[PDB]
Write an enzyme that holds these catalytic residues in place. Sequence first.
Site, PDB file in Angstrom:
ATOM      1  CG  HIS A  22     -47.875  40.226 -28.822  1.00 46.10           C
ATOM      2  ND1 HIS A  22     -46.836  39.331 -28.669  1.00 46.10           N
ATOM      3  CD2 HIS A  22     -49.014  39.519 -28.595  1.00 46.10           C
ATOM      4  CE1 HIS A  22     -47.320  38.152 -28.320  1.00 46.10           C
ATOM      5  NE2 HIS A  22     -48.639  38.233 -28.279  1.00 46.10           N
ATOM      6  CG  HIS A  65     -51.936  38.291 -26.980  1.00 40.50           C
ATOM      7  ND1 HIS A  65     -51.644  37.438 -28.025  1.00 40.50           N
ATOM      8  CD2 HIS A  65     -53.089  38.923 -27.320  1.00 40.50           C
ATOM      9  CE1 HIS A  65     -52.576  37.557 -28.960  1.00 40.50           C
ATOM     10  NE2 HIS A  65     -53.466  38.448 -28.553  1.00 40.50           N
ATOM     11  CG  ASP A 114     -48.051  35.532 -24.155  1.00 37.12           C
ATOM     12  OD1 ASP A 114     -48.872  36.412 -24.507  1.00 37.12           O
ATOM     13  OD2 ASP A 114     -47.452  34.785 -24.972  1.00 37.12           O
ATOM     14  CG  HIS A 122     -48.992  35.972 -32.274  1.00 37.81           C
ATOM     15  ND1 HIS A 122     -49.662  34.797 -32.012  1.00 37.81           N
ATOM     16  CD2 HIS A 122     -49.075  36.718 -31.142  1.00 37.81           C
ATOM     17  CE1 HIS A 122     -50.144  34.837 -30.782  1.00 37.81           C
ATOM     18  NE2 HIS A 122     -49.804  35.994 -30.239  1.00 37.81           N
ATOM     19  CG  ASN A 155     -54.655  33.066 -29.466  1.00 30.61           C
ATOM     20  OD1 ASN A 155     -55.698  33.128 -30.111  1.00 30.61           O
ATOM     21  ND2 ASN A 155     -54.291  34.006 -28.595  1.00 30.61           N
TER      22      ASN A 155
END
Length: 230
Positions: A83, A85, A87, A148, A179
């Site tokens: 995804h 983000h 990280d 998420h 988050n």
Amino acid sequence: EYPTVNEIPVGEVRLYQIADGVWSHIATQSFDGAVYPSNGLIVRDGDELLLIDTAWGAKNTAALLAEIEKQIGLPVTRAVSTHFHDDRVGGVDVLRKAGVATYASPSTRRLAEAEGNEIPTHSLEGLSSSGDAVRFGPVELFYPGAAHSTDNLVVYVPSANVLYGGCAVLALSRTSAGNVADADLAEWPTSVERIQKHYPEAEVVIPGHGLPGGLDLLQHTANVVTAHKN
Ligand SMILES: [Zn+2]
Ligand SMILES: [Zn+2]
Ligand SMILES: [Zn+2]
């Protein structure tokens, strides 16, 4: 024996062998006042490697490439970010400059761009709708639905029945959904159910952050997210 957050200073990367030709990579990063661990995957692809997710930042991802060279000694040729983000895509530019073909769904690329993050270059086709699955070298990529994030993918390694849930799957240590800035709490339990139904024979389940476990990480995730949502 799995590396924990307490054991990994920010800037160092550990590898953990899960099976013949399957590893997780573990890094740590300073985020929102704390230090968090983060997982990704490495899967042998003949005499090459497929990387799943960056090690959360440029310096971490450079260390990851160095660690792969001295521990495995095969080149990373392709990478998939699961995804948008940091990280998952933070370090994509390091990968690209090192000769790696970086991939993500069109949705992930769009969202990464909008977030001001690094943008995987190549687009994954065939993953636009809930339940879609495609083969990508030694793995299967699956879009279970929003969780998420709206774009999150999971990764299955059929040679070892390894399910890499990424951040759509929570570790047993998580007492919250984490988050949730970009999450769809309403859909997330249904998306977990899709994973459960599509990968009933998974032996190992790897979350995006924290310790791997068995299939009950999936139901754990549904439980925590439903409680959160309520
Ligand atoms: Zn995320
Ligand atoms: Zn390219
Ligand atoms: Zn994450």
